[PDB]
Structure formats: structure tokens, C-alpha cells
Design an enzyme around this catalytic site. Structure first.
Site, mmCIF file in Angstrom:
data_model
loop_
_atom_site.group_PDB
_atom_site.id
_atom_site.type_symbol
_atom_site.label_atom_id
_atom_site.label_comp_id
_atom_site.label_asym_id
_atom_site.label_seq_id
_atom_site.Cartn_x
_atom_site.Cartn_y
_atom_site.Cartn_z
ATOM 1 N N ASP A 1 35.466 48.157 37.113
ATOM 2 C CA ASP A 1 36.747 47.459 37.186
ATOM 3 C C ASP A 1 37.926 48.215 36.557
ATOM 4 O OD1 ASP A 1 38.694 45.542 37.651
ATOM 5 O OD2 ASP A 1 37.972 44.159 36.109
ATOM 6 N N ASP B 1 43.426 48.894 41.483
ATOM 7 C CA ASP B 1 42.431 47.956 40.946
ATOM 8 C C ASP B 1 41.145 47.869 41.767
ATOM 9 O OD1 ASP B 1 41.094 45.998 39.549
ATOM 10 O OD2 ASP B 1 42.404 44.343 40.184
HETATM 11 C C1 LIG Z 1 41.546 40.929 39.448
HETATM 12 N N1 LIG Z 1 40.315 41.095 38.669
HETATM 13 C C2 LIG Z 1 39.555 40.080 38.177
HETATM 14 O O1 LIG Z 1 39.749 38.867 38.307
HETATM 15 C C3 LIG Z 1 38.354 40.692 37.424
HETATM 16 N N2 LIG Z 1 38.642 42.116 37.605
HETATM 17 C C4 LIG Z 1 39.730 42.264 38.288
HETATM 18 N N3 LIG Z 1 40.334 43.455 38.639
HETATM 19 C C5 LIG Z 1 37.089 40.220 38.167
HETATM 20 C C6 LIG Z 1 36.828 40.667 39.487
HETATM 21 C C7 LIG Z 1 35.673 40.230 40.197
HETATM 22 C C8 LIG Z 1 35.467 40.664 41.529
HETATM 23 C C9 LIG Z 1 35.261 39.677 42.533
HETATM 24 C C10 LIG Z 1 35.084 40.103 43.877
HETATM 25 C C11 LIG Z 1 35.146 41.493 44.168
HETATM 26 N N4 LIG Z 1 35.366 42.427 43.219
HETATM 27 C C12 LIG Z 1 35.524 42.023 41.938
HETATM 28 F F1 LIG Z 1 35.730 42.994 41.031
HETATM 29 C C13 LIG Z 1 34.778 39.317 39.574
HETATM 30 C C14 LIG Z 1 35.035 38.866 38.256
HETATM 31 C C15 LIG Z 1 36.191 39.303 37.560
HETATM 32 O O2 LIG Z 1 36.389 38.847 36.278
HETATM 33 C C16 LIG Z 1 37.683 38.935 35.694
HETATM 34 C C17 LIG Z 1 37.558 38.667 34.178
HETATM 35 C C18 LIG Z 1 38.935 38.870 33.502
HETATM 36 O O3 LIG Z 1 39.422 40.188 33.767
HETATM 37 C C19 LIG Z 1 39.622 40.493 35.154
HETATM 38 C C20 LIG Z 1 38.280 40.342 35.921
#
Ligand SMILES: CN1C(=O)[C@]2(N=C1N)c1cc(-c3cccnc3F)ccc1O[C@H]1CCOC[C@@H]12
Ligand code: NI
Length: 393
Positions: free
Chosen positions: A34, A223
Site C-alpha cells: 500500500d 496509490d
Molecule cells: C485508499 N486506501 C485504503 O482505504 C487502504 N489503503 C489505501 N490506499 C486500504 C485499501 C484496501 C484495498 C481494497 C481493495 C483493493 N486494494 C486495496 F488496497 C483494503 C483496506 C485498506 O485499509 C485502509 C486502512 C487505513 O489506511 C488506508 C487503507
């Protein structure tokens, strides 16, 4: 960097993960990669969607930091206990580091049924770490404790189960087999998110003609943790109008443009050429220069195999509205080899050796484009009293 090639896996739309080990002896977990967050956090208690979790008690090298962490966000939350332990990436550099680890004890709408990941690797900067910027992110620890160069790169490659995806996270370097043509760099505007500046947007070679600040309202970020290309409301509306116009021979439901409904064609008959290319011009390293990254409908129309009609090729529209700025998510990144050059405060883009294309068009990275009297396209987020009151020692 052959040992790091093909080290990413996942399910379409559910994020890319890397295998990591935590503790002594090493406990294997699959961890979401991430670039949009800054905590290393792992499931550490039973959950309906987890086959396994970090067992702190099984690790001789685990240290409790005696501090909790609470992380709410738009779609849910995770929370737990802070600690440190030994961490490595089996298909990564041959090193082991002591990193901060948030042991997730309670969450809501965080884990995803069938995604096959049990934690998250926040690769962004300390500024956005929770509980605060004093919690050193994983990559910072990796660089400080080892000889690993301060750079990583990502190559994300796009009937009963979701389609499997693959890719590469190269830690400490750039693998030349993962791209073709030129590698173009855009400045990291500020080290918090991987923030960049978009100076121009075209849909099928036609300028959207908006004040360029609109493209970066209230930020633009790269991102890996967002599936879609997400655009500020005004920009999203302009883009949808332009893509609708180009594809007008086909009348899709409103649900499609909202990303809430699939559209299908008979197997192998998808009329790709009625859907326009989208070009984002990014600020160059040189004043007055930009370069463009150009993506195809093969990137912004995500394949989804429908059980009821496996006869057909079905797609979800993967451009969506944002109220928190532009997000260049997996939709954008799947076109390109993306270099997060932290050492030089810049992000590189080159055509990915694995991107999905046809015999007529290709995803492209092209420049330079020069503008005589380039405006400042950056937006300045209004300063809250909360933020202003923070002391930064
Ligand atoms: C936008 N975004 C999210 O909501 C987040 N990572 C990103 N980039 C995130 C993305 C996903 C996520 C979902 C689907 C595809 N790719 C992904 F990665 C899942 C959980 C998640 O938890 C969040 C917890 C708080 O920080 C951000 C985190
Ligand atoms: Ni002070």
C-alpha cells in the site's frame, strides 16, 4: 533482482500482496502492498476472513510497546497494539529488520473475504502514520538498518473465483527487464502521500481545458492501495462526458458509469476502439516540462467473469469520483513500471513489459512537453487549527 520478480499476487480488485515473515521463528503472512498509507499492521487475532494471524506469543523476538493504535477511515477501521519484531521479505532483499508492527486485534470492513492477505504494508511517509509521525514506517527502518538503497519499484500486472493478478515489487532497485522505452520522472511534491502534480488531462487527444489546479484538488497521489483511477468531482464529470461521447454507438445504463453495473459483449468481440485513451500530463523534473502517461480502455475497464454469462466478456468501469483529490490507483499503475525514488524525491514511469494492450494502441510514456509560462497547478490545502497547533520536534 530476479529473486524479487513476480513476488506479488492477488485477486482482481482486492489489492496486491507480498509474502512477509514476522517474528522468530519466521511466521509467514501475506501483506497488502500500500503506497497510500504508512503503517505496517497485521491481523493478530482470529477473524472470519483470516486463515491465519500473527501469533505474538510464538515469537521470541517480539517486544510490546505498551501503546494502542486506532485507525478509522472512510470505509471502516482497524485497531490494536503496537510492538516491534523481526521482519523479512522472503522474495525480497536478503535482510532482516526490527520494525514497528501494529497487531490488529479489532477491525471493521478492513479484511476482505477471499483476498488472501492478512495485513498491510504502508509504504508512504511518516507524516501520515498512526498514531503519529513518531512511529517509524517499515521502509524507513529497512533503509536505516541495512544497506538497501532508498528506492522501491512496482510492476502491477492486470468463473467461480475472481481473476488472479501478479506483479513485482523490487526493493532497493530498478529492474530493466520490467519496462521498455524511456523512464520519466515527476517530482514528489511533498513527502506524506506520494503526492504529484498533474498539469494537463486529455481524453482521446482532446484537452479537458480546466484550470490545472482542478486536477490536483485537493491533492494527486500514486496509490497501489486504490483499485480505480479516482478523479475530483468536476474532473470526473468532464471525463465521463468525453468518454460517453466517444463510445456513443453504445448506450450503457447509468449504473455502468457509476461503477455499479457490468457491461458485456460476446467473447472476444469487445469494441475496444470506441473507447478513448486517457492522458495525464505530469510535471517534469525541469521547469516548464511535462511528460504524459497514456492508458487504454484495457486499463480502465476491469474484466469481471460473470457466472450467469461466462459466454461473455464483462467489464466494470474503473474510473470513479473523489472528494479527496486524484488517486492514480491500480488502473493507472497497471500500465506502467513505477519507480518510487525516495532518495531523489521523485516518481518514475515507464511502459510496463506486462501491460494489457491490443495490436492498434499501447499504454505510453512520452515527453518532453514544454509550456512557455507554466502555471502552478498545485493546490494548497486550507490549514486547520488542529494541524497548525502540532509541534514538530
Ligand atoms: C485508499 N486506501 C485504503 O482505504 C487502504 N489503503 C489505501 N490506499 C486500504 C485499501 C484496501 C484495498 C481494497 C481493495 C483493493 N486494494 C486495496 F488496497 C483494503 C483496506 C485498506 O485499509 C485502509 C486502512 C487505513 O489506511 C488506508 C487503507
Ligand atoms: Ni513544542
Amino acid at each position: 533482482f530476479v529473486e524479487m520478480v513476480d513476488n506479488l499476487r492477488g485477486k482482481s480488485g482486492q489489492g496486491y500482496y507480498v509474502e512477509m515473515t514476522v517474528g522468530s521463528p519466521p511466521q509467514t503472512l501475506n501483506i497488502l502492498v500500500d503506497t497510500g498509507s504508512s503503517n505496517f499492521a497485521v491481523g493478530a487475532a482470529p477473524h472470519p476472513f483470516l486463515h491465519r494471524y500473527y501469533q505474538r506469543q510464538l515469537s521470541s523476538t517480539y517486544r510490546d510497546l505498551r501503546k494502542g493504535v486506532y485507525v478509522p477511515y472512510t470505509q471502516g477501521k482497524w485497531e490494536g497494539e503496537l510492538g516491534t519484531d523481526l521482519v523479512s521479505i522472503p522474495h525480497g532483499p536478503n535482510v532482516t529488520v526490527r520494525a514497528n508492527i501494529a497487531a490488529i486485534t479489532e477491525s471493521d470492513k478492513f479484511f476482505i473475504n477471499g483476498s488472501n492477505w492478512e495485513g498491510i504494508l504502508g509504504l508512504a511517509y511518516a507524516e501520515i502514520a498512526r498514531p503519529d509521525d513518531s512511529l517509524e514506517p517499515f521502509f524507513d527502518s529497512l533503509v536505516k538498518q541495512t544497506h538497501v538503497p532508498n528506492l522501491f519499484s512496482l510492476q502491477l500486472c492486470g468463473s467461480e473465483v475472481l481473476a488472479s493478478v501478479g506483479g513485482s515489487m523490487i526493493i532497493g532497485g530498478i529492474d530493466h527487464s520490467l519496462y521498455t522505452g524511456s523512464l520519466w520522472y515527476t517530482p514528489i511534491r511533498r513527502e506524506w502521500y506520494y503526492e504529484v502534480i498533474i498539469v494537463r488531462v486529455e481524453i482521446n487527444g482532446q484537452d479537458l481545458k480546466m484550470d490545472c489546479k482542478e486536477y490536483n484538488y485537493d491533492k494527486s497521489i500514486v496509490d497501489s492501495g486504490t483499485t480505480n483511477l479516482r478523479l475530483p468531482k468536476k474532473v470526473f464529470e468532464a471525463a465521463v462526458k468525453s468518454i460517453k461521447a466517444a463510445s456513443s454507438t453504445e448506450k450503457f445504463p447509468d449504473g455502468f458509469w457509476l461503477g455499479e453495473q457490468l457491461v458485456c459483449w460476446q467473447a472476444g468481440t469487445t469494441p475496444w476502439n470506441i473507447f478513448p485513451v486517457i492522458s495525464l500530463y505530469l510535471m517534469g523534473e525541469v521547469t516548464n516540462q511535462s511528460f504524459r502517461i497514456t492508458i487504454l480502455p484495457q486499463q480502465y475497464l476491469r474484466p469481471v467473469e460473470d457466472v450467469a454469462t461466462s459466454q461473455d466478456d464483462c467489464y466494470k468501469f474503473a474510473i470513479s469520483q473523489s472528494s479527496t483529490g486524484t488517486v492514480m490507483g491500480a488502473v493507472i499503475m497497471e500500465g506502467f513500471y513505477v519507480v518510487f525514488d525516495r532518495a531523489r524525491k521523485r516518481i518514475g514511469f515507464a511502459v510496463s513489459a506486462c501491460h494489457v494492450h491490443d495490436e492498434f494502441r499501447t499504454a505510453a510514456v512520452e515527453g518532453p512537453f514544454v509550456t512557455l509560462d507554466m502555471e502552478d497547478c498545485g493546490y494548497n490545502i486550507p490549514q486547520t487549527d488542529e494541524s497548525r497547533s502540532h509541534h514538530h520536534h
